[PDB]
Amino acid sequence: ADREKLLTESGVYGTFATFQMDHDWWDLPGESRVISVAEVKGLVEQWSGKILVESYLLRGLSDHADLMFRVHARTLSDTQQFLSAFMGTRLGRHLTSGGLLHGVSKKPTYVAGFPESMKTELQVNGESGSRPYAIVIPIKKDAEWWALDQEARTALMQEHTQAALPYLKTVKRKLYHSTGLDDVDFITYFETERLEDFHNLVRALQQVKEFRHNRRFGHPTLLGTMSPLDEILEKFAQ
Template sequence: MSPSLLEGEYAKFNFYKLDKTWRRLPEDEKEASKREFTSVISEIGTESPITTYGLTGTRGDCDIMLAQSSMDLDDFDKTAKRINHTHLAGYLDQSYSYLAVRRKTQYKHGGAEPKLQDYYKYFIIYPMVKKREWYQLNQDERQKMMGDHFKIGHKYPSIKINTTYSFGLDDQEFVVGFETDEPREFVSLVMDLREIPGGFYTESETPIFACVRKPIEEALEAVG
Protein backbone atom coordinates (compact mmCIF):
# COMPACT_ATOMS: atom_id res chain seq x y z
CA MET A 1 0.00 0.00 0.00
CA SER A 2 0.98 3.59 -0.63
CA PRO A 3 -0.47 6.29 1.62
CA SER A 4 -2.23 7.53 -1.56
CA LEU A 5 -5.97 7.02 -1.17
CA LEU A 6 -9.08 6.65 -3.26
CA GLU A 7 -11.86 9.23 -3.00
CA GLY A 8 -13.97 8.48 0.09
CA GLU A 9 -11.47 6.04 1.53
CA TYR A 10 -10.66 6.15 5.25
CA ALA A 11 -7.08 6.35 6.51
CA LYS A 12 -5.71 5.38 9.90
CA PHE A 13 -2.20 6.27 11.02
CA ASN A 14 -1.07 4.38 14.14
CA PHE A 15 2.22 5.15 15.90
CA TYR A 16 3.66 2.68 18.41
CA LYS A 17 6.49 2.63 20.94
CA LEU A 18 7.99 -0.61 22.24
CA ASP A 19 8.63 -0.66 25.98
CA LYS A 20 12.32 -0.87 26.95
CA THR A 21 11.66 -4.15 28.77
CA TRP A 22 11.24 -5.68 25.32
CA ARG A 23 14.99 -5.53 24.73
CA ARG A 24 15.65 -7.55 27.89
CA LEU A 25 13.63 -10.55 26.74
CA PRO A 26 15.43 -13.74 25.65
CA GLU A 27 16.33 -13.66 21.97
CA ASP A 28 14.22 -16.69 21.09
CA GLU A 29 11.15 -15.12 22.70
CA LYS A 30 11.67 -11.86 20.82
CA GLU A 31 12.15 -13.64 17.51
CA ALA A 32 8.98 -15.69 17.96
CA SER A 33 7.06 -12.53 18.86
CA LYS A 34 8.38 -10.70 15.79
CA ARG A 35 7.39 -13.57 13.52
CA GLU A 36 3.88 -13.63 14.95
CA PHE A 37 3.44 -9.87 14.62
CA THR A 38 4.85 -9.84 11.08
CA SER A 39 2.45 -12.62 10.10
CA VAL A 40 -0.54 -10.73 11.54
CA ILE A 41 0.38 -7.51 9.69
CA SER A 42 0.82 -9.49 6.47
CA GLU A 43 -2.62 -11.07 6.89
CA ILE A 44 -4.22 -7.68 7.56
CA GLY A 45 -2.60 -6.34 4.39
CA THR A 46 -4.36 -8.93 2.26
CA GLU A 47 -7.73 -7.56 3.43
CA SER A 48 -7.09 -3.81 3.45
CA PRO A 49 -3.86 -2.09 2.31
CA ILE A 50 -1.33 -1.35 5.04
CA THR A 51 2.13 0.22 4.80
CA THR A 52 4.74 -0.05 7.54
CA TYR A 53 7.34 2.50 8.60
CA GLY A 54 10.16 2.81 11.11
CA LEU A 55 10.86 5.87 13.28
CA THR A 56 13.49 4.51 15.68
CA GLY A 57 16.12 6.80 14.18
CA THR A 58 13.94 9.89 13.72
CA ARG A 59 11.76 10.17 16.88
CA GLY A 60 12.20 9.26 20.50
CA ASP A 61 8.55 8.63 21.34
CA CYS A 62 7.60 6.07 18.67
CA ASP A 63 9.29 3.21 16.83
CA ILE A 64 6.88 2.08 14.13
CA MET A 65 3.95 3.50 12.16
CA LEU A 66 1.21 1.56 10.42
CA ALA A 67 -0.73 3.39 7.69
CA GLN A 68 -3.90 1.55 6.75
CA SER A 69 -6.66 2.45 4.30
CA SER A 70 -10.15 1.05 3.80
CA MET A 71 -13.59 1.99 2.55
CA ASP A 72 -14.98 0.37 5.71
CA LEU A 73 -14.26 2.14 9.01
CA ASP A 74 -14.83 -1.10 10.92
CA ASP A 75 -11.66 -2.57 9.41
CA PHE A 76 -9.57 -0.42 11.76
CA ASP A 77 -11.34 -1.93 14.76
CA LYS A 78 -10.57 -5.39 13.42
CA THR A 79 -6.93 -4.45 12.97
CA ALA A 80 -6.65 -3.16 16.54
CA LYS A 81 -8.20 -6.35 17.88
CA ARG A 82 -5.80 -8.59 15.98
CA ILE A 83 -2.78 -6.56 17.04
CA ASN A 84 -3.91 -6.49 20.68
CA HIS A 85 -4.04 -10.29 20.74
CA THR A 86 -0.38 -10.71 19.77
CA HIS A 87 2.43 -11.37 22.23
CA LEU A 88 4.15 -8.16 21.12
CA ALA A 89 1.12 -6.10 22.18
CA GLY A 90 2.09 -6.68 25.80
CA TYR A 91 5.10 -4.41 25.20
CA LEU A 92 3.51 -2.05 22.68
CA ASP A 93 2.17 1.41 23.57
CA GLN A 94 0.22 3.46 21.03
CA SER A 95 1.88 6.88 21.13
CA TYR A 96 -0.31 8.62 18.55
CA SER A 97 -3.32 7.80 16.39
CA TYR A 98 -4.92 9.80 13.57
CA LEU A 99 -8.12 9.04 11.66
CA ALA A 100 -9.11 10.77 8.41
CA VAL A 101 -10.87 10.36 5.07
CA ARG A 102 -9.88 11.29 1.52
CA ARG A 103 -11.99 14.04 -0.09
CA LYS A 104 -11.70 16.10 -3.24
CA THR A 105 -10.20 19.52 -2.54
CA GLN A 106 -12.39 22.59 -3.00
CA TYR A 107 -9.44 24.57 -4.38
CA LYS A 108 -8.13 24.71 -7.95
CA HIS A 109 -4.52 23.63 -8.22
CA GLY A 110 -3.63 25.11 -11.59
CA GLY A 111 -0.85 23.78 -13.80
CA ALA A 112 -0.28 20.25 -15.04
CA GLU A 113 -0.25 17.28 -12.71
CA PRO A 114 3.35 16.18 -12.01
CA LYS A 115 4.47 12.67 -12.90
CA LEU A 116 4.79 10.81 -9.63
CA GLN A 117 6.33 7.48 -8.73
CA ASP A 118 4.66 4.71 -6.74
CA TYR A 119 7.33 4.24 -4.09
CA TYR A 120 9.03 6.82 -1.88
CA LYS A 121 11.42 6.08 0.96
CA TYR A 122 10.20 8.77 3.35
CA PHE A 123 6.72 9.75 4.50
CA ILE A 124 6.54 12.97 6.54
CA ILE A 125 3.18 13.37 8.24
CA TYR A 126 1.50 15.70 10.72
CA PRO A 127 -1.96 16.68 12.01
CA MET A 128 -3.08 20.20 11.15
CA VAL A 129 -5.66 22.65 12.47
CA LYS A 130 -6.59 25.95 10.81
CA LYS A 131 -7.51 29.09 12.74
CA ARG A 132 -11.22 29.90 12.88
CA GLU A 133 -10.49 33.14 11.00
CA TRP A 134 -9.63 31.05 7.93
CA TYR A 135 -13.19 29.82 7.64
CA GLN A 136 -14.54 33.38 7.85
CA LEU A 137 -12.75 34.33 4.62
CA ASN A 138 -14.71 34.08 1.39
CA GLN A 139 -13.86 31.42 -1.20
CA ASP A 140 -11.99 33.82 -3.49
CA GLU A 141 -9.70 34.99 -0.67
CA ARG A 142 -8.93 31.43 0.35
CA GLN A 143 -8.39 30.35 -3.25
CA LYS A 144 -5.84 33.14 -3.76
CA MET A 145 -3.83 32.07 -0.72
CA MET A 146 -4.08 28.40 -1.61
CA GLY A 147 -2.93 29.35 -5.11
CA ASP A 148 0.28 30.71 -3.55
CA HIS A 149 0.60 27.44 -1.67
CA PHE A 150 0.21 25.39 -4.86
CA LYS A 151 2.75 27.52 -6.76
CA ILE A 152 5.38 26.72 -4.16
CA GLY A 153 4.45 23.05 -4.25
CA HIS A 154 4.97 23.00 -8.03
CA LYS A 155 8.58 24.08 -7.45
CA TYR A 156 9.15 20.70 -5.81
CA PRO A 157 7.70 18.16 -8.28
CA SER A 158 9.50 15.24 -6.65
CA ILE A 159 7.45 15.65 -3.45
CA LYS A 160 4.01 14.05 -3.38
CA ILE A 161 1.37 15.46 -1.03
CA ASN A 162 -1.46 13.48 0.56
CA THR A 163 -4.15 15.53 2.32
CA THR A 164 -6.88 13.78 4.29
CA TYR A 165 -9.79 15.28 6.23
CA SER A 166 -10.64 14.62 9.88
CA PHE A 167 -13.47 17.10 10.58
CA GLY A 168 -15.76 15.44 13.12
CA LEU A 169 -13.78 12.18 13.10
CA ASP A 170 -10.74 13.14 15.17
CA ASP A 171 -9.25 16.07 17.10
CA GLN A 172 -7.36 17.56 14.13
CA GLU A 173 -8.95 18.97 10.96
CA PHE A 174 -6.49 17.48 8.49
CA VAL A 175 -3.77 14.87 8.35
CA VAL A 176 -1.15 16.00 5.86
CA GLY A 177 1.49 13.67 4.49
CA PHE A 178 4.40 14.20 2.10
CA GLU A 179 6.19 11.41 0.27
CA THR A 180 9.76 12.05 -0.86
CA ASP A 181 13.13 10.43 -1.43
CA GLU A 182 15.01 13.54 -0.30
CA PRO A 183 13.98 15.06 3.07
CA ARG A 184 16.24 18.08 2.48
CA GLU A 185 13.92 19.19 -0.32
CA PHE A 186 10.99 18.96 2.07
CA VAL A 187 12.80 21.28 4.50
CA SER A 188 13.16 23.83 1.68
CA LEU A 189 9.49 23.43 0.76
CA VAL A 190 8.34 24.11 4.31
CA MET A 191 10.66 27.12 4.64
CA ASP A 192 9.16 28.59 1.47
CA LEU A 193 5.62 27.99 2.75
CA ARG A 194 6.41 29.92 5.93
CA GLU A 195 6.80 33.09 3.87
CA ILE A 196 3.33 33.19 2.27
CA PRO A 197 0.28 34.92 3.84
CA GLY A 198 -1.77 31.73 4.12
CA GLY A 199 0.54 30.43 6.82
CA PHE A 200 -0.89 33.02 9.22
CA TYR A 201 -4.12 31.03 9.35
CA THR A 202 -2.50 27.81 10.57
CA GLU A 203 -3.27 27.13 14.23
CA SER A 204 -1.19 23.97 14.65
CA GLU A 205 0.81 21.51 12.55
CA THR A 206 2.62 19.41 15.14
CA PRO A 207 3.80 16.85 16.01
CA ILE A 208 5.68 16.07 12.81
CA PHE A 209 6.81 12.53 12.07
CA ALA A 210 9.59 11.64 9.61
CA CYS A 211 8.81 8.01 8.79
CA VAL A 212 11.10 5.64 6.89
CA ARG A 213 9.28 3.12 4.74
CA LYS A 214 10.43 -0.45 5.42
CA PRO A 215 9.02 -3.96 5.99
CA ILE A 216 7.63 -4.47 9.49
CA GLU A 217 10.30 -7.07 10.30
CA GLU A 218 13.02 -4.50 9.58
CA ALA A 219 11.27 -1.85 11.66
CA LEU A 220 11.06 -4.27 14.60
CA GLU A 221 14.66 -5.37 14.16
CA ALA A 222 15.79 -1.77 14.61
CA VAL A 223 14.14 -1.69 18.04
CA GLY A 224 16.04 -4.70 19.37
Protein backbone atom coordinates in the same frame (compact mmCIF):
# COMPACT_ATOMS: atom_id res chain seq x y z
CA ALA B 1 -3.54 -2.49 -8.13
CA ASP B 2 -6.10 -2.74 -5.24
CA ARG B 3 -3.35 -1.35 -3.04
CA GLU B 4 -3.02 1.45 -5.65
CA LYS B 5 -6.79 1.98 -5.33
CA LEU B 6 -6.70 2.38 -1.54
CA LEU B 7 -3.79 4.84 -1.91
CA THR B 8 -5.39 7.02 -4.61
CA GLU B 9 -9.21 6.78 -4.48
CA SER B 10 -11.57 9.18 -2.70
CA GLY B 11 -13.58 8.05 0.33
CA VAL B 12 -10.75 5.95 1.80
CA TYR B 13 -9.75 6.32 5.47
CA GLY B 14 -6.13 6.78 6.39
CA THR B 15 -5.03 6.08 9.93
CA PHE B 16 -1.66 6.93 11.46
CA ALA B 17 -0.83 4.88 14.56
CA THR B 18 2.42 5.43 16.43
CA PHE B 19 3.94 3.11 19.11
CA GLN B 20 6.96 2.88 21.46
CA MET B 21 8.52 -0.50 22.35
CA ASP B 22 8.83 -1.22 26.08
CA HIS B 23 12.25 -1.74 27.73
CA ASP B 24 11.22 -5.27 28.78
CA TRP B 25 10.79 -6.24 25.12
CA TRP B 26 14.56 -5.95 24.64
CA ASP B 27 15.03 -7.66 28.00
CA LEU B 28 13.28 -10.61 26.22
CA PRO B 29 15.13 -13.52 24.45
CA GLY B 30 15.48 -13.03 20.66
CA GLU B 31 13.93 -16.46 20.00
CA SER B 32 10.57 -15.51 21.55
CA ARG B 33 10.78 -12.14 19.76
CA VAL B 34 11.28 -13.89 16.38
CA ILE B 35 8.02 -15.80 17.07
CA SER B 36 6.26 -12.59 18.17
CA VAL B 37 7.31 -10.98 14.86
CA ALA B 38 5.86 -13.89 12.84
CA GLU B 39 2.53 -13.46 14.74
CA VAL B 40 2.31 -9.79 13.64
CA LYS B 41 3.31 -10.65 10.05
CA GLY B 42 0.58 -13.31 10.16
CA LEU B 43 -2.06 -10.83 11.34
CA VAL B 44 -1.21 -8.30 8.62
CA GLU B 45 -1.52 -11.04 5.95
CA GLN B 46 -4.86 -12.08 7.45
CA TRP B 47 -6.20 -8.53 7.07
CA SER B 48 -4.71 -7.97 3.59
CA GLY B 49 -8.07 -8.50 1.83
CA LYS B 50 -9.69 -5.58 3.65
CA ILE B 51 -6.98 -3.06 4.55
CA LEU B 52 -3.56 -1.85 3.47
CA VAL B 53 -0.88 -1.63 6.20
CA GLU B 54 2.43 0.17 5.61
CA SER B 55 5.18 0.43 8.18
CA TYR B 56 7.73 3.11 9.19
CA LEU B 57 10.70 3.17 11.54
CA LEU B 58 10.49 6.28 13.75
CA ARG B 59 13.08 5.11 16.34
CA GLY B 60 16.01 7.55 16.35
CA LEU B 61 14.19 10.15 14.23
CA SER B 62 10.96 11.02 16.10
CA ASP B 63 11.06 11.62 19.87
CA HIS B 64 9.21 8.99 21.94
CA ALA B 65 8.19 6.89 18.93
CA ASP B 66 9.61 3.67 17.51
CA LEU B 67 7.04 2.46 14.98
CA MET B 68 4.28 3.91 12.83
CA PHE B 69 1.61 2.21 10.79
CA ARG B 70 -0.24 3.97 8.01
CA VAL B 71 -3.45 1.98 7.46
CA HIS B 72 -5.88 2.47 4.57
CA ALA B 73 -9.42 1.13 4.84
CA ARG B 74 -12.88 1.75 3.41
CA THR B 75 -14.36 1.43 6.91
CA LEU B 76 -12.71 2.73 10.12
CA SER B 77 -14.29 -0.16 12.02
CA ASP B 78 -11.97 -2.46 9.99
CA THR B 79 -9.01 -0.33 11.04
CA GLN B 80 -10.19 -0.46 14.67
CA GLN B 81 -10.39 -4.24 14.59
CA PHE B 82 -6.92 -4.60 13.06
CA LEU B 83 -5.28 -2.17 15.49
CA SER B 84 -7.01 -3.78 18.50
CA ALA B 85 -5.88 -7.24 17.32
CA PHE B 86 -2.34 -5.89 16.70
CA MET B 87 -2.16 -4.37 20.19
CA GLY B 88 -3.21 -7.74 21.70
CA THR B 89 -0.39 -9.65 19.97
CA ARG B 90 2.62 -10.70 22.08
CA LEU B 91 4.56 -7.92 20.37
CA GLY B 92 1.60 -5.52 20.66
CA ARG B 93 1.26 -6.14 24.40
CA HIS B 94 4.81 -4.74 24.80
CA LEU B 95 4.12 -1.62 22.68
CA THR B 96 3.12 1.58 24.35
CA SER B 97 0.63 3.04 21.96
CA GLY B 98 1.14 6.71 21.22
CA GLY B 99 -0.58 8.88 18.65
CA LEU B 100 -3.59 7.99 16.54
CA LEU B 101 -4.95 10.18 13.79
CA HIS B 102 -7.60 9.50 11.10
CA GLY B 103 -8.75 11.25 7.94
CA VAL B 104 -10.56 10.59 4.68
CA SER B 105 -9.39 11.13 1.08
CA LYS B 106 -11.50 13.58 -0.95
CA LYS B 107 -11.57 14.87 -4.53
CA PRO B 108 -9.85 18.29 -4.55
CA THR B 109 -11.97 21.34 -3.56
CA TYR B 110 -9.85 24.15 -5.05
CA VAL B 111 -7.83 22.77 -7.95
CA ALA B 112 -10.70 23.38 -10.44
CA GLY B 113 -10.30 27.14 -9.76
CA PHE B 114 -6.57 27.25 -10.58
CA PRO B 115 -4.82 28.32 -13.86
CA GLU B 116 -4.63 25.58 -16.49
CA SER B 117 -0.80 25.37 -16.22
CA MET B 118 -1.08 24.78 -12.48
CA LYS B 119 -3.73 22.06 -12.93
CA THR B 120 -1.35 20.43 -15.44
CA GLU B 121 1.65 20.69 -13.12
CA LEU B 122 -0.35 19.13 -10.27
CA GLN B 123 -0.44 15.88 -12.28
CA VAL B 124 3.13 15.36 -11.00
CA ASN B 125 3.30 13.87 -7.46
CA GLY B 126 6.62 12.33 -6.39
CA GLU B 127 8.89 9.92 -8.14
CA SER B 128 10.61 6.56 -8.02
CA GLY B 129 12.67 5.94 -4.91
CA SER B 130 13.22 3.04 -2.55
CA ARG B 131 12.63 3.31 1.23
CA PRO B 132 12.07 7.05 1.37
CA TYR B 133 11.82 9.24 4.39
CA ALA B 134 8.24 9.92 5.45
CA ILE B 135 6.84 12.95 7.27
CA VAL B 136 3.45 13.40 8.92
CA ILE B 137 2.23 16.86 9.97
CA PRO B 138 -1.20 17.27 11.58
CA ILE B 139 -2.82 20.68 11.03
CA LYS B 140 -5.68 22.64 12.59
CA LYS B 141 -6.86 25.83 10.87
CA ASP B 142 -8.00 28.91 12.65
CA ALA B 143 -11.65 30.04 12.80
CA GLU B 144 -10.74 32.95 10.45
CA TRP B 145 -9.96 30.42 7.70
CA TRP B 146 -13.44 28.86 7.78
CA ALA B 147 -15.09 32.29 7.81
CA LEU B 148 -13.50 33.07 4.43
CA ASP B 149 -15.64 32.17 1.46
CA GLN B 150 -14.69 29.67 -1.23
CA GLU B 151 -13.28 32.27 -3.67
CA ALA B 152 -10.95 33.71 -1.01
CA ARG B 153 -9.76 30.28 0.07
CA THR B 154 -9.21 29.31 -3.59
CA ALA B 155 -6.93 32.39 -3.97
CA LEU B 156 -4.94 31.45 -0.88
CA MET B 157 -4.64 27.81 -1.96
CA GLN B 158 -3.33 28.92 -5.38
CA GLU B 159 -0.56 30.80 -3.51
CA HIS B 160 0.17 27.67 -1.44
CA THR B 161 0.40 25.55 -4.62
CA GLN B 162 2.56 28.19 -6.39
CA ALA B 163 5.14 28.04 -3.57
CA ALA B 164 5.08 24.22 -3.72
CA LEU B 165 5.60 23.82 -7.50
CA PRO B 166 9.38 23.31 -7.32
CA TYR B 167 8.80 20.23 -5.07
CA LEU B 168 6.18 18.31 -7.12
CA LYS B 169 8.65 15.66 -8.26
CA THR B 170 10.97 15.44 -5.26
CA VAL B 171 8.26 15.23 -2.55
CA LYS B 172 5.25 12.90 -2.79
CA ARG B 173 2.18 14.35 -1.05
CA LYS B 174 -1.12 13.04 0.31
CA LEU B 175 -3.88 14.93 2.15
CA TYR B 176 -6.39 13.47 4.59
CA HIS B 177 -9.50 15.29 5.78
CA SER B 178 -9.59 14.75 9.54
CA THR B 179 -12.10 17.18 11.10
CA GLY B 180 -14.38 15.54 13.69
CA LEU B 181 -12.38 12.28 13.91
CA ASP B 182 -9.67 13.66 16.27
CA ASP B 183 -8.39 17.12 17.31
CA VAL B 184 -7.08 18.28 13.89
CA ASP B 185 -8.51 19.30 10.54
CA PHE B 186 -5.92 17.69 8.24
CA ILE B 187 -3.26 15.05 8.25
CA THR B 188 -0.53 15.79 5.69
CA TYR B 189 1.77 12.97 4.57
CA PHE B 190 4.94 13.17 2.52
CA GLU B 191 7.63 10.91 1.16
CA THR B 192 11.04 12.09 0.00
CA GLU B 193 14.56 10.82 -0.64
CA ARG B 194 15.98 14.31 -0.04
CA LEU B 195 15.08 15.80 3.39
CA GLU B 196 16.65 19.11 2.57
CA ASP B 197 14.12 19.46 -0.31
CA PHE B 198 11.27 18.82 2.13
CA HIS B 199 12.74 21.36 4.54
CA ASN B 200 12.92 23.91 1.65
CA LEU B 201 9.30 23.13 0.68
CA VAL B 202 8.04 23.86 4.19
CA ARG B 203 10.09 27.08 4.31
CA ALA B 204 8.56 28.17 1.00
CA LEU B 205 5.11 27.57 2.39
CA GLN B 206 5.83 29.49 5.61
CA GLN B 207 5.72 32.73 3.57
CA VAL B 208 2.21 32.25 2.12
CA LYS B 209 -0.91 33.72 3.75
CA GLU B 210 -2.59 30.30 4.17
CA PHE B 211 0.27 29.29 6.55
CA ARG B 212 -0.71 32.20 8.86
CA HIS B 213 -4.14 30.48 9.41
CA ASN B 214 -2.64 27.39 11.07
CA ARG B 215 -3.79 27.36 14.73
CA ARG B 216 -1.78 24.16 15.15
CA PHE B 217 0.91 22.73 12.95
CA GLY B 218 2.82 19.56 13.93
CA HIS B 219 2.94 18.55 17.63
CA PRO B 220 4.07 16.05 16.64
CA THR B 221 5.88 16.35 13.36
CA LEU B 222 6.58 12.65 12.73
CA LEU B 223 9.73 11.75 10.79
CA GLY B 224 10.54 8.19 9.80
CA THR B 225 12.00 5.80 7.26
CA MET B 226 9.61 3.77 5.16
CA SER B 227 10.36 0.09 4.83
CA PRO B 228 8.95 -3.45 4.66
CA LEU B 229 7.31 -4.65 7.85
CA ASP B 230 9.63 -7.67 7.92
CA GLU B 231 12.79 -5.52 7.79
CA ILE B 232 11.61 -3.25 10.67
CA LEU B 233 10.31 -6.04 12.88
CA GLU B 234 13.62 -7.91 12.29
CA LYS B 235 15.44 -4.96 13.91
CA PHE B 236 13.03 -5.33 16.85
CA ALA B 237 13.86 -9.09 16.96
CA GLN B 238 17.66 -8.57 17.44
